[PDB]
Scaffold this active site. Structure first.
Site, PDB file in Angstrom:
ATOM      1  N   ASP A 181       0.818  -1.195   0.000  1.00 44.04           N
ATOM      2  CA  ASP A 181       0.000   0.000   0.000  1.00 44.04           C
ATOM      3  C   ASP A 181       0.867   1.267   0.000  1.00 44.04           C
ATOM      4  OD1 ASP A 181      -2.395  -1.545  -0.035  1.00 44.04           O
ATOM      5  OD2 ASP A 181      -2.382  -1.683   2.137  1.00 44.04           O
ATOM      6  N   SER A 188       9.335   1.746   5.043  1.00 46.69           N
ATOM      7  CA  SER A 188       8.188   1.280   5.850  1.00 46.69           C
ATOM      8  C   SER A 188       8.425  -0.117   6.468  1.00 46.69           C
ATOM      9  CB  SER A 188       6.892   1.322   5.079  1.00 46.69           C
ATOM     10  OG  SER A 188       6.836   0.314   4.120  1.00 46.69           O
TER      11      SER A 188
HETATM   12 NA    NA Z   1       6.202  -1.565   8.298  1.00 48.22          NA
END
Ligand code: NA
Ligand SMILES: [Cl-]
Ligand SMILES: [Cl-]
Ligand SMILES: [Cl-]
Ligand SMILES: [Cl-]
Ligand SMILES: [Cl-]
Ligand SMILES: [Cl-]
Ligand SMILES: [Cl-]
Ligand code: NA
Ligand code: NA
Ligand code: NA
Ligand code: NA
Ligand code: NA
Ligand code: NA
Lengths: 307, 325
Positions: free
Chosen positions: B274, B304
């Site tokens: 995402d 991330s």
């Molecule tokens: Na993450």
């Protein structure tokens, strides 16, 4: 503010204080239980309002009780939703505490109606931080919630035990009639902590297992329940009611001859809150418990039409 | 009203529209997975903001995108909390719809503390009512959400498929660049419905499994032939993500390019896909071509995976090493 506000004069101060738990019930209906690593979808979902403390307050509130809930929820929207729901069911929320450091308490409940099995993960969240020290800090050492007009306290065993016990002791010292429903069932070290507080409990209302764990009497029937009543009075409890599920209940009012009255999620909570409501209206223990027992059957029916 | 309000001048009309899911993540950490008939306590609990739609919007919003979320949530507190959270992540919520007849969509997620495995039950709730007919009724047949200056639409596969397909078609017909990330993986009946709409998809960004399901094509060289399959089905630009093998892409039928994964120590990859998609679109909205955008998206996704928290792990500009923004 979703919560009620108290007045300077105390003109809306409650007759009944409930100090206990508020848990949202997140119920996912599934075609089978998830296996390890599985992502699946529910077939249906339902969001309910539970926690034994809220349940017992709402039972009283729905009958008209001047009841107030003392508990801890989050500053989250879930907390806001509970506060409004309590108000809509006749429960004053002025002493509901909110913490930005925890979520509102909840239970995640999976139900397979096919196999009618459950899996339940209980997440007390904010509840775990509802300590005596925090309570005292927010209430001027209980002075804010234990006013002179206060007639009844209801506690359960679904918040930190020291909070339940210390509240019971403090309310009892002020001449409040204290009601302790020891649910869920106390663990061995909890039984040990509880017993010395039993002299501050006006009314102990266990089921059979709870009575068994506290007294050491194996309660499975009326005879053994009567024996448990005696064991509890010896530990210093004034009034005793032992519920026998569908088979009714036994009670003794301040050591008088015990009485047996002949005969479902949250039915026990309905019984307890209803019982206190009727006592607050001036019914004695037996009259209150008969009326409570009927309210509890009516609750099951009303609940059954909705779900 | 928690939701944003539009101006009659279109002063705040977004550059990027995301039409997809918002799910609250209810995360219970447990000593062990509950067995049938078991009642247990969690060790701890975490409330998070998920749904692939919101995740992708938030990835973009956090980088500074003029992004708006179109979705359906409850009138409940969870709904209100999501609407505020979106604003706090730079996402316009003017076209968030609310229903009092359903709770906000949520995922109930159990995480085993030792084995680190999960069990997840998705409860789409309000999301199930996010239909083309309702969308149309609330937007004047898409007029309100598809204004002239709108440059990008992003869809996933976590709302009713007709809402996704009808929106992609209408957007594409107005000259909006449509991005379709077919996640979660389309089911067989979904594949048949989707294929006819692929000519309306500007950018199709599947993973390996998803590319397989759509194309019939089962590594880098098969991914390249899947790309050709997708171009034949009408898709203009294609990006296929390969997990650890990075990804492959072709801009408008040009010779495919393979890009290597950023080799990092992956502590939690939840929501990283995402992150990649939202970041990719952000960078394209700032004027980068598809390859440049995906390289920068790749750097963002890499960042991330180095921490837990799903949306919370998505970078803000100030956190990024030089040469990403
Ligand atoms: Na993450
Ligand atoms: Cl409030
Ligand atoms: Cl309810
Ligand atoms: Cl928490
Ligand atoms: Cl709103
Ligand atoms: Cl989050
Ligand atoms: Cl719902
Ligand atoms: Cl953050
Ligand atoms: Na009333
Ligand atoms: Na009331
Ligand atoms: Na407070
Ligand atoms: Na805390
Ligand atoms: Na923004
Ligand atoms: Na539909």
């Amino acid at each position: 503010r979703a919560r009620n506000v108290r007045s300077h004069t105390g003109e809306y101060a409650p007759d009944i204080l409930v100090v206990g738990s508020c848990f949202l019930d997140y119920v996912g209906y599934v075609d089978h239980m998830p296996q390890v690593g599985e992502t699946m979808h529910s077939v249906s979902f339902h969001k309910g309002f539970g926690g034994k403390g809220a349940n017992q307050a709402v039972a009283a509130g729905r009958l008209g009780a001047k009841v107030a809930m003392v508990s801890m929820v989050g500053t989250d929207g879930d907390g806001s939703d509970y506060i409004k729901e309590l108000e809509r069911n006749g429960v004053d929320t002025a002493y509901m505490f909110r913490t930005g450091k925890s979520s509102t308490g909840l239970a995640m409940i999976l139900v397979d109606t096919k196999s009618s099995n459950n899996e339940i993960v209980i997440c007390p969240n904010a509840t775990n931080h509802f300590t005596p020290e925090l309570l005292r800090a927010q209430t001027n050492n209980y002075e804010r919630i234990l006013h002179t007009g206060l007639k009844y306290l209801i506690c359960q065993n679904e918040i930190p035990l020291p909070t339940t016990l210390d509240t019971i002791k403090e309310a009892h010292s002020r001449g409040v009639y204290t009601v302790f429903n020891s649910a869920p069932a106390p663990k061995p070290a909890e039984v040990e902590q509880i017993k010395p507080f039993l002299p501050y409990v006006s009314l102990f209302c266990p089921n059979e297992v709870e009575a068994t764990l506290i007294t050491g009497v194996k309660v499975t029937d009326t005879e053994s329940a009567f024996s448990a009543i005696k064991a509890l009075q010896q530990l210093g409890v004034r009034d005793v009611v032992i519920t026998l599920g569908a088979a009714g209940f036994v009670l003794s009012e301040n050591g008088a001859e015990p009485v047996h009255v002949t005969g479902t999620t949250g039915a026990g909570d309905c019984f307890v809150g209803s019982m206190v409501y009727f006592m607050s209206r001036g019914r004695n223990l037996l009259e209150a418990c008969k009326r409570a027992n009927e309210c509890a059957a009516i609750s099951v029916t009303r609940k059954g039409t909705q779900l």
